[PDB]
Amino acid sequence: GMASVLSAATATDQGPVRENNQDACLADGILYAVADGFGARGHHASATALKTLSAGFAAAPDRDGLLEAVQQANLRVFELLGDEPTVSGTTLTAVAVFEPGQGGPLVVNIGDSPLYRIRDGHMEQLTDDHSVAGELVRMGEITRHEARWHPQRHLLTRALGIGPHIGPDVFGIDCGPGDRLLISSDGLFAAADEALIVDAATSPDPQVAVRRLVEVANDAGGSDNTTVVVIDLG
Template identity: 70%
Template sequence: MARVLAAATATDQGPVRVSNQDAVLVEGVLYAIADGFGVVGDQASRLALDTLRAGFVAAPDRDGLLAAVRRANERVCAHVTSDGSSSGCTLTAVAMFDDEQGGPMVVNIGDSPLYRIRDGRMEQLTADHSVAGELVQAGEITREDARFHPQRHLLTRALGIGPVIRVDVADLDCRPGDRLLISSDGLFAAADESAIADAASAPEPETAVRQLIEVANNAGGSDNTSVIVIDLG
């Protein structure tokens, strides 16, 4: 069974955006990033993770996590509806449950990706719920094409855009020596994937998260960037 040896987080507004609409959560075995969009996107992402945390603390198991995600959507949806804005947020949450609780799992909606770095290879474990992401999944464009697609930021699924949501839920194939990377899509807005992979492979998680922010900002920093790096042993 893989367990968490070390983890680090970082979030940065970047040189272009006037505010940071990302939010990051670490709560026990739970690690999550929410990326807000729209006028009150910063409020949506923070509300989502505050709700997720409260629900998970009350019921720190698989069912509790899924219930907390649904509750987060309800609260974000109610908030943005009362505000009258077209806002919401993505959510990617990794729970490092032990074998007795069913093992590690990921829940995601939107386009904040989860990657696994194993034996020097970085592999995306989640699907991007965006127009460009769905074209990649359909085999119509490549991942490189998706980075520059005119509708790459147009989400097809997110928290807050309706009372009923469809999230992806998956068990995680983890083993000692793996590194997990959760990020907002700002990390991939302009930076080359090889530069991201190099930064993500730094010896310590604290160094990796700092370098990942630098890579994103040096590539233009057109969006907020948030990252969580988790080492497993």
């Protein structure tokens, strides 16, 4: 029988507008993550968060261990950047594709780098965005569709590395054989046509998918860094 993860691919692209690529991604065994950094040291924040997350998960690759790795990542980034004249930090969305005996796949997320599931040709967002716009969506006041270009979607309400305490969302992922997961930074949906994003995301080869997703985002203007992780499940 099949493993829970069949294959995965990642891509990151600075795009033609931003002066730095402050996004980072991770694909490490059953652990996958995207971190979207912000601020003068946003690159430092996202890279340090993922380095720390990877190390912590390796030392304790279970649900509690993943949560304590996210706490560790928060503290490490805060210790390194918290002293700076301006605020820098990062989002973090991590997925651990645990087998059923370890509770099944788990998402831990902070900020606005979403997790999507692609099932039967549909792509749906599984996570809450911790932004001003994300709160409006939660309450039913705007659609997700609406929210992608809301003037306040860039105002984060949770981030890693900006203080000593964080409360990420933590939930199991309802997924199974044939499903695909996509973790992305917000840059993917900054401007491109949703149908075109789904077309790219559904490309049979995950390595083609991630390249097409970066191309779609850049063709549409590439206003932000775009980073994607595609995971095919078994």
